[PDB]
């Protein structure tokens, strides 16, 4: 029904949602810290000086494990 | 449809799977560092000592910002 093409859209959106900003195809697993941005898998999130989110300096990343993985 | 039933079912499971595990009722936003279990809102991780999914001790919490996060 039209109502399972609405539920399909929410889900996708939600997984989307889940998926690494910079290379859309591996899921969020890193943290920046101190920021807390959690917005990129672990490769993209390696070579990154200051959160693509808000410009602040990396000191770290923390991996992630989140119940979602 | 069965598949709307089915759809429902997907959808409850993947928000609830974004629920802190203790209280059941806020969105997950703290990770155990150094472990790195993501599992807490910040209520029930500011007053966990171990890790409730590993037991490492908690040295401190960080805050995580999610593209996932709602209010
Ligand atoms: C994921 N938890 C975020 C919210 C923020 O504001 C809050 C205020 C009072 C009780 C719980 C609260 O939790
Ligand atoms: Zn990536
Ligand atoms: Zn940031
Ligand atoms: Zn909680
Ligand atoms: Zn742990």
Do not use: A, D, N
């Given at each position: 029904s039209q109502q399972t093409r609405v539920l399909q859209?929410?889900?996708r959106k939600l997984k989307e949602a889940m998926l690494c900003m910079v290379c859309?195809?591996?899921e969020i697993n890193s943290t920046?810290?101190?920021?807390?941005?959690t917005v990129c898998c672990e490769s993209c999130a390696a070579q990154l000086q200051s959160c693509?989110?808000?410009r602040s300096r990396?000191?770290?990343v923390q991996?992630?494990?989140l119940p979602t993985h």
């Open positions: 859209e929410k889900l859309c195809e591996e920046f810290c101190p920021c807390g941005h693509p989110v808000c990396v000191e770290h991996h992630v494990y």
